[PDB]
Structures are given as C-alpha cells and as structure tokens.
C-alpha cells in the first residue's frame, strides 16, 4: 500500500513536475480515499523526500561495504558506478529525474541534500585516489547520473534486480567511468561487485 | 535593450524557481517596470519561455550543423563539436541549459525546441558511430556535454566569457572525456583547430 503510492507519486512528479501535482492526483492515480493516503503521508513534501532518499540512501549504505573488498581504488570505483546504475534501472518509474526539479535545493530537502553530498564525495575522493588533484575527479559521479537521461519512465522497470547479472547500461558506464580516469580495467569486475552486493544481505 | 533584460530576468526566476511557479508579476518587479510594459513586449509567461529556449538551442544547432561538415576525420569533427557546445553553455550570465530539464518543456507548444534537440543529437550520436559503429557508446558523448549543465555556477556572473584565442578547461576536459569514452585518440592540435574553426564562423 505504501509502495503504490510512492509509485504513483514517481509517475506524477516525473512527468508534471512538484508544484502542479496535487495530493488529490496522487489518491485518485491510487485508487484510494484522500484521508487513507493523509494516514500514510501527511503532505505532498514528505513523500517527494522519501522518493529522493530512497534513491542516493541505499548507494551510501552499500560504500560503508566498499573497504572490505581487499581491493584497489579502480575496483572500488568501479563497483560503486555500478550498483548505483543498477539502482537507477531498477525501479517503475524513472526517479532520479527528480533531482533536476528546481525545488529540491529548498531547505525542507536538507535530508536528502546530506546523503547527496555524501555520494558526491565518497565518488570524488575514489577518482582523487586514481588521477590526484584533477578536474576529472568530477566525472565519475556525472557519469553515473546521465542514465537518468537515457532509460524509459512508462512505468516498466528497464532492469529489474538480479542476484547474479548487472545490466549492460551499468557495465558500460561503469566502463566509461573508469576510461575517463585513464584507469584500467580489472578483468574480475563484474563478479567482484554482485559477490559484493550479495553480502550487503 | 528592454526585451534583452525582460528575457535575463526570466532566465534568472525560470531557472531558480521552475516554469509554474514563476508569475509575470515577478518578472516585471525583477525588472523595475510596470505589469503593462512587460505586456507589451511580451503577451505571456509561455511566449517568454520558448524565446529563451529558440535563444539557446539555435545557435548550437548551427554550430553543430556546420563543424559536423569539416575536412578533418570524425574523433577532430567530434571533439571540436563538443568542446564548442560547452564553450556556448558556459558564456551566459544564467545557466539556461538548466531549462531543458523542467518538464513542461515535453508539450507540444515547444515542438521547434524538440527538432533542434532532436537535430543535434543525431549529429552527436552518427559522429561517435563513424568511430565505434553501432555500439551504445555512440549516446555518451552528448550526456557528457550536457553534464555541464550540473557543474556550473547560476549566479549572474559568466563563468567563462567568450574568448577568441581561449577555450575553458572544463570545455577541455569534457571533450577530451567524451572521444575518451569511446577509445579515441585525442588529436595533438585540437584546442587550436577548434578555435580556428570557430573564428571562420564569423
Ligand atoms: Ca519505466
Ligand atoms: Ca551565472
């Protein structure tokens, strides 16, 4: 029940944007009674912020796994590119364009504009590790968000979770990432990091 | 130049505050004029809109348009192309490329806006599959440009005004990034091939 509204708001705020969309679409998408949603949410606000985390709050939580790894920073790296596209493609609706809404710098957000920080410097400082004090320390965390511009929002999950397959899209921006840095790519990539998912379970 | 100032001011709100909760009141108080002088110049908050839109998608398209037809190979056409693109998105007092992203603009009152996008990326994409086929490499290069929009200041102060002997280093690095991520070679002379190019568009 709870899911279905997070969905349906997705669809709406992705396509209509914040501001337009009312709490009054969100129980009609639904099929609910307005009060029945007031119980689970109590305002518009609070469940465009459970959006946003649900969205850079997994990513964090997985980079705490990121040391116990035995690993170099490539593989680190790259590993993280890659669960976070995975993340990306994993949901009914396209998410991560919500970010792009203007209203998200506001200071209701600052939850979510906390765990972004956090995201943008465990990438930046990864890549410092790789090319020291270089712009292109930068890259690696664009990268990994133009997916956002690339996969469908007609609510069909583009790749849905799988315990022993990361998606192409993941792998070649992952890829991608790594070839800006002029690192080299581990051979053992791909297993490495769903070996690495699987244990943050 | 009234107009000039009417069409800043709405840049500033529009990328600030976003397409709907933007009023014509402000607009015209940013401005230091009165509702009916602002009418006169323009009727609506839409009209407004889709000048800033046509104001910045054109003059990349027909930057695009024309380096994509140049006698070098396709890794110089691209590099060049993207370098100039970031150049354009980095001269404005305001970050209008941070407008494409609202999601009004996908109506069909801006179907001149999606040709042009439209355009553009098929030039991106065809230059990046002469140098690595029909792989999905080919789309990066164009998010890659566009990831400036992400980067740069939205403040009223240019981040980097246009210089005729001079490309900004993100401009630099953002190109060097995207022949990077399809295994291209970067060309020695690019930056003043590049430069060149766009003096002999004038
Ligand atoms: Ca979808
Ligand atoms: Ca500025």
Redesign the pocket.
Same mark, same amino acid.
């Given at each position: 029940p709870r899911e279905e509204i997070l969905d349906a708001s997705a669809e709406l705020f992705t396509h209509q944007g914040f501001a337009t969309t009312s709490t009054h679409q969100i129980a009609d998408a639904v099929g609910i009674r307005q009060a029945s949603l007031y119980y689970h949410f109590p305002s518009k606000t609070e469940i465009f912020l459970t959006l946003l985390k649900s969205t850079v709050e997994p990513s964090t939580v997985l980079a705490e796994d990121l040391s116990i790894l035995d690993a170099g920073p490539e593989m680190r790296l790259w590993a993280i590119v890659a669960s976070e596209v995975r993340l990306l493609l994993s949901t =009914?609706?396209?998410v991560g364009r919500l970010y792009q809404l203007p209203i998200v710098g506001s200071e209701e957000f600052a939850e979510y504009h906390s765990q972004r920080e956090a995201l943008t410097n465990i990438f930046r400082d990864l890549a410092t590790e790789i090319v020291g004090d270089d712009p292109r320390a930068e890259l690696p965390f664009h990268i990994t968000m133009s997916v956002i511009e690339m /996969? /469908?929002?007609?609510? =069909?999950?583009?790749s849905p979770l799988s315990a022993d397959s990361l998606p192409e899209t993941a792998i070649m921006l992952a890829d991608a990432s790594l070839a800006v840095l002029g690192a080299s790519l581990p051979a053992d990539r791909v297993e490495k990091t769903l070996e690495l998912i699987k244990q943050a379970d």
């Open positions: =009914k609706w396209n /996969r /469908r929002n007609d609510g =069909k999950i583009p």
